[PDB]
Paper text:
The centrosome, which plays a central role as the main microtubule (MT)-organizing center for animal cell division, is a membraneless organelle composed of a pair of orthogonally arranged MT-derived apparatus, called centrioles, and the surrounding pericentriolar material (PCM). Here, we demonstrate that two of the human PCM scaffolds, Cep63 and Cep15212–14, cooperate to generate a higher-order cylindrical self-assembly capable of recruiting their downstream components, such as Plk4, a key regulator of centriole duplication.
In particular, identical hydrophobic residues in the parallelly aligned Cep152 helices appeared to constitute the backbone of the bundle by engaging in pairwise ladder-like interactions (top). Cep63 helices did not directly interact with each other, but rather interacted with both Cep152 helices in an antiparallel fashion (middle and bottom). Since Cep63 P1 and Cep152 M4d form an elongated four-helix bundle that may serve as a building block for the self-assembly, the mode of interaction between the bundles may likely determine the directionality of the assembly that positions Cep152 at the outskirts of the Cep63 arrangement.
Numbering used by the authors:
A (entry chain C): 499 to 541, 1205 to 1249
B (entry chain A): 499 to 541, 1202 to 1248
Write the structure that this text describes.
């Protein structure tokens, strides 16, 4: 029954990582409506907008790297626990 | 016996998704230079600024869609390991 706990954990880990991507998408969507409103109420905005997407994408790249790195450690931990189970 | 091959595979998948990630970041930067270039000309400037904004949001939705597929596959992998752990009780 080791692996069922592994899958339960993946299911949680999956729910969290997707939550923190929605957070990032929405922040982009909010900041960018504001900035498009500034420019429309006027007659520099290209840098705020592009600035924002770079922000959202950077944060997505960080969070995906932390997930990936956690995943590798988890796998290595299981490699370890398998070898411990070989004890006579 | 089994779990080192799981790790290896995890390493491989992890590098393939990060190639994918930088791949369509860089692609989606090409797509924006075209429409940014239009908006710079017009000083319809705003309808064109919304379109750009709609491309950034859409681009970051495609990144999410690839990231969901990756996650989904991890769940499928772990599921396959529940199965094979069950088969080894045989």
């Amino acid at each position: 029954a080791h692996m069922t706990r592994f899958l339960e954990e993946e299911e949680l880990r999956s729910h969290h990582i997707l939550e923190r991507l929605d957070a990032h998408i929405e922040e982009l969507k909010r900041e960018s409506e504001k900035t498009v409103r500034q420019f429309t109420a006027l007659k520099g905005a290209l840098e705020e907008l592009r600035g924002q997407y770079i922000k959202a994408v950077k944060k997505i790249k960080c969070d995906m790297l932390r997930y990936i790195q956690e995943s590798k450690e988890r796998a290595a931990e299981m490699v370890k626990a398998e070898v411990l189970r070989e004890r006579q």
